């Protein structure tokens, strides 16, 4: 038991524990990714839940989890997943961005602002991502202005 704990603590995952291969996990990501794009959001959510449990350090399983939740209108729960995902990949702008969208839908402007603002910075830094950087900039304005008319 203390061996399992030390494993877990040092950063081992359930995948490792059950000798689950990188390629089996990828298969399951693919299934989840297709289902999400098929609009089968509820089913995609269940897949991403399994992935997040199998490897609880992969930001993109948390991105997927969060995207399913947002599509189902579960905005609060999506912010939770986008938040944990960010912590696993601090340079990824999609996390604060889609969390901000979710925050705006709930009327939380101060945090929507924070999200769109970080999403812009992080997206700016990478030049592959200027379109998203711009969207973030726009929504940032939309939020600041919706904030002023309160």
């Amino acid at each position: 038991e203390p061996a399992i704990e030390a494993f877990l603590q040092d950063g081992g995952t359930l995948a490792m524990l059950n000798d689950v291969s990188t390629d089996t996990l990828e298969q399951l990501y693919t299934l989840g990714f297709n289902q999400y794009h098929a609009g089968k959001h509820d089913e995609a959510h269940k897949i991403f839940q399994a992935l997040c449990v199998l490897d609880h350090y992969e930001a993109r399983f948390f991105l997927g989890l969060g995207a399913c939740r947002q599509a189902l209108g579960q905005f609060r729960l999506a912010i939770d997943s986008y938040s944990y995902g960010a912590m696993m990949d601090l340079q990824e702008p999609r996390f604060p961005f889609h969390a901000a969208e979710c925050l705006l839908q709930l009327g939380e402007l101060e945090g929507a602002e924070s999200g769109f603002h970080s999403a812009q910075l992080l997206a700016a830094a990478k030049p592959e991502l200027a379109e998203l950087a711009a969207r973030a900039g726009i929504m940032l304005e939309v939020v600041k202005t919706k904030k002023d008319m309160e």
């Binding site: 877990l8 950063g11 089996t24 839940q49 399994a50 992935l51 991105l63 599509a71 938040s83 924070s114």
Partner: protein, 183 residues
Amino acid sequence: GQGVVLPQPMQQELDQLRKTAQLGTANAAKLLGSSTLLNKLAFASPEEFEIKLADLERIRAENLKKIDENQTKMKEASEAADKAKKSGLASKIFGWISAIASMVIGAILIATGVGAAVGAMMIVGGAVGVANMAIQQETMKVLGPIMIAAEILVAIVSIAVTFGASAASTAMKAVKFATQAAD
């Protein structure tokens, strides 16, 4: 779902793998249809277990790369949170972060990979996640914090089941102290 751009990737075995992964929370829900209680225990455990090291060392060695990466993620997350709470730019780049996730950072400071584990468990939702989703109409909302506690508690059990019960115990301590650090 055309809202989020997920990164691009790269039939009955996948249902095996999904059952594997939900196995811990399935057993968790099962064991929590009783009268346990605690609930409000007297130093958590024994628990119970009721109902091999060379392998672990092989596995560990086989995945030195990923394990180090995961350690780095936790290190970089801890640091990011450290440098954010010193500076006045705490709630400017991280004000969007939810309260749950915020505790999970705390749990990671107290218990590293065990903190992350239980934290991810809470966020994944698993057992009472479907109820929680349903709870989205309806009144004020002290219903919120308790659904957390519910989730925390289920996650602890799930950890107990899936990994050590010392792991669950540490996870409880982690959540405890991340919760006090939160005030």
